[model samples]
Target chain A: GKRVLIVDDATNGREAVEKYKELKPDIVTMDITMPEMNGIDAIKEIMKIDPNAKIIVCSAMGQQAMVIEAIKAGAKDFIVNTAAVENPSLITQIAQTFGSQAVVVAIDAKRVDGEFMVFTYSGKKNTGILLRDWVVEVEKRGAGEILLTSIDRDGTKSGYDTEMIRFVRPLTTLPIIASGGAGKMEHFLEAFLAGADAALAASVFHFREIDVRELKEYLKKHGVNVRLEGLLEHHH
Target chain B: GKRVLIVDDATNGREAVEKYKELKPDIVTMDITMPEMNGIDAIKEIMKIDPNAKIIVCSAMGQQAMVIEAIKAGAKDFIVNTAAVENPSLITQIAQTFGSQAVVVAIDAKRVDGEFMVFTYSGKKNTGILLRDWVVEVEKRGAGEILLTSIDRDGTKSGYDTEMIRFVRPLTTLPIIASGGAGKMEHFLEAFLAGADAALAASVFHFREIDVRELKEYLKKHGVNVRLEGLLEHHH
Candidate 1:
């Protein structure tokens, strides 16, 4: 079921890909440039496992032409694999380009100047204009699916970005995914009220803040059409 | 190896995809409003068989929203199924946006009447100044790969759009693919010599006036460093 493999060479690169895999995994998130083996060699090894493997090579920057050649070499996609992720949007674009629904939406919420900075990726005051322009262009370009993340409660697991997602839902008739800060069952319900087609969590889902099966149960109890994948659904 | 499938009820749409696949394509072209299973379901079925499948869906006029949904549902690319392929540039933009290498070129060729006819999809010639401005904008948008197609020999394929390609190629560093005319294999060879990186032919490649494989063989025999695919190298 996994459709992407992130091939990186560093410990941090592997961790970044693992996070991305957790966010919206495809095939496999692997770091080919890691200590034991380089990304390309990893690709070769993975190809042996599945000849038609869809792999992504994450490299240190300044390898533009090499990245292009990797595509020529049958690599499905590429991303930044440095110490820390610099361009998650670019990574998401690459995934979208290759027909993969893999993206990392960052919420930038902070109490700036006594103002509750609940800036969604699509709702920043400064970046909001740019985001609006991009969303408009994306819709015009026929992007009917959108993912909105609220920076306000990202790691807190306090709740999803309901206000931000609600704002985005009315802009166009596109399906919006509300991501970030889903600490518990109630947070998932908040995301639905905000009109998010789905809710994506990280620290919550990763640190056992909530389980997929349990979350689905809460969703179903609240009159949402949550589909279960052969597991007993849970709700508190 | 045949990855591109054209599931069109219409004879022409199916024919085009089939013809392209004959050349070993990674992009399948399908018509969404086709008679039987419809384009969406066909893609879904194909994706069920292989989640990594890449498909370019075709839609008739005014179906932009559904087209966007198709992209969200994992269609890799899109082409308009209307007459004149009205938005080839839009299709080109989508392909480029999706991070694929597209074969697009600009032309400053003059008609036999001595008026410069800048060839474009769904349009007539614009003034030279307007055309130049458009070219400048195209370059600014990171379209590093472009071709300069000449209207003069567009159908004649007499020789590669040398003057037009030469003039435009120097304007920007984008690799130019010379299109418009190719009466024989010699024309392709000449285009390369005149600084064209690639040659595109509709009649010659389509009507079988020139055998693509044989033309490459001739180029190789003549000592050109053209890349051949599996049949020929990847070099153009």
Candidate 2:
């Protein structure tokens, strides 16, 4: 079983440090905006305690400046809060500092009137921009990877938005993770066939709706080159 | 077709007034966090210009105080950004000022280890709380309605996270609009059966994956009481 240690403290880096000391977690998620000590200070504190501490910085929209500072402070990854794909310069800066692989851009899009409109702030704010346009823009802005979510198909256990994948494939060469839709093995297949480099789903795997090894094998049978080494051997 | 007049600039109230005069749109979405005059000032200016102008205030997270002020300034409705269900007192204030119908809370959640965890800022930050617990707390805090989305099933064309719906039903009596996992007519059926008063889907309706009239008819046949008068008559 994958062990996870959660440290939820707005301020007081000591709390995260204490948890780190106790759990020695493989990865630690730190929020950049905290009541006290802030995420950068906490990240610095954690890094001082454990030089090799893998810290992921979590931030919300309009915190690009803070995220850049966090990355400079030796954070492994950063997750921005907004869903709509905005700011290429931010992504460019991250990639410039920590390499392109360190930057991950997540996009949440809702189809409206035959066009996928990008949304931010958890689908509440409609950005009024088309998904295809945003995808291309994010890639141009130097995003290393794309986490695409279909706001409509999320948690449905139905299928991935393969058409979306297909539409987005030619738009960018960045590694695309098709999220917000994956119910059946066929859905995964469709996503991959349509050009998804990865498929991200929660309930299907969390609830054991499908086995990872079996899914990998199925994908392998369909000529999807997947690594099933330790994953197949160690079944959750 | 409905005509829309977009008032982009908050500082130039004259711009909005000019648009209102020229376009005479049905509704206007006013952003509270705008440059120049800001949304509150803009709302005041617009209302003064046209007392009958229907306006809705849109705000981002951490701007609850501003939203309340906007509502007091005569904005008809308010939409707070992000998916994570937080700030109960904010909802309570809104409900107190206007009505329970004026307060609508949007929840974006992802299933983690068989439990739905609230997410906000485009699924970037996890609130680290169970959906049921949050639902119960929000209802107690005075949220009139809930916009729920399963982060995993969004845009997947799989189905609704009815398990989430059923789990949420017993928690609160607030009108729930099931979102973020709607693929087909059957998904809507499942959501309604699981206790969702309304089903909210974007892609299916946007892409013509399923017709709204057909969906309503399908739901009606399944015993879900829904108004299909204007919708059934206007075949899109």
Off by over 4 Å in 2: A1-30, A36-55, A63-69, A81-86, A221-223, A228-236, B1-236
| Cα lDDT of model 1 by residue, A100-167, tens digit | 33332233433344443333212323222233444444454434355455555554446776766665
User: Given candidate 2, what's the lDDT at residue B9?
Assistant: 29
Task: Residues B1-236, candidate 2: write the lDDT tens digits.
Answer: 01101112222233455565565555566655422234466668768878875775666656467767877788766554362255557777777877777666778888877778887655545567777787887777777777787767765567888888888888887888777656667776677778887765545554466776677677668666764211000000
How far out, in Å, is residue A168 in model 2? 0.3
Candidate 2 chain B has its poorest 10 consecutive residues by lDDT at: B227-236
DockQ of each: 0.01, 0.04
Per-model lDDT: 0.47, 0.63
What TM-score, to 2 decimals, does candidate 1 have? 0.37
Give a tens-digit lDDT track for model 2, residues A1-236: 11111222222234555666665555566655422234576678777888885765665655467767876788777544362245557777766777777667888878888888887755645678888888888877667778788877775567888877788889888888778756877887777777878766545554466787688778778776764211000000
Worst 10 residues of 2 chain A by lDDT: A227-236
